[PDB]
Structure 1
């Protein structure tokens, strides 16, 4: 197989197979198989090219992979050039959503160094 953004889906069940794209989680994957009329409990084996392109046409509606990644990064840059709080924190590699930094903030800061 090969769908929307260069990626080659594994020989795992249809729903978990599609989640491999950057822009489709558990919900879009349950709806894309519902809008194309394909089962969720079936592997890539038996799924012919006529069934693959109809799922490619279904996912093309919502911005996925590289087209989505630049949009995510654009909003981040927009905030940064505006001079906002939300921006000044993406620029300082610190948690934006208001979390505590006095301790436990290792995901945004990265690993510690004395």
Structure 2
């Protein structure tokens, strides 16, 4: 089923299928599934009613576009602020209190 938020969960159990949307981790998935809609099946075995329910529920939590521009405007704001964390976002060095003498490698690769 493609329709859920422009993206494609494919041929799997419903939760771990729903997770492929940017904006849904482990919690929102099994919450939406096992609380509101109530049904657990494969993806393509989803009847029209359950599917509508799903789309309508996932439409009230933020998604790829919205979240990406959300964190983007958070980071942007902090960069404009000229605070410390922002200096680090601009320079490309870890801001969470990690030491720079050795392993930045994940964040230094850029």
TM-score tier after normalising by the smaller chain length: over 0.9
1:93 and 1:52 mapped to 2: Cα distance?
42
The alignment's C-alpha RMSD in Å is 1.3
Q: Which runs of 5+ in 1 are unaligned?
A: none
Which residue does 2:10 correspond to in 1?
A: 10
Moved beyond 3 Å, runs of 4+: none
2:55 and 2:105 mapped to 1: Cα distance?
38
Matches within 5 A, 1:11-90: 11-33=11-33, 34-39=35-40, 42-90=41-89
Which residue does 1:110 correspond to in 2?
A: 109
What is the deviation of 1:3? 3.9
Query: What's the TM-score, normalizing by structure 1?
Result: 0.89
What is the deviation of 1:6? 1.1
- As a proportion of its length, which structure holds more helix? 2
Q: Which runs of 5+ in 2 are unaligned?
A: none
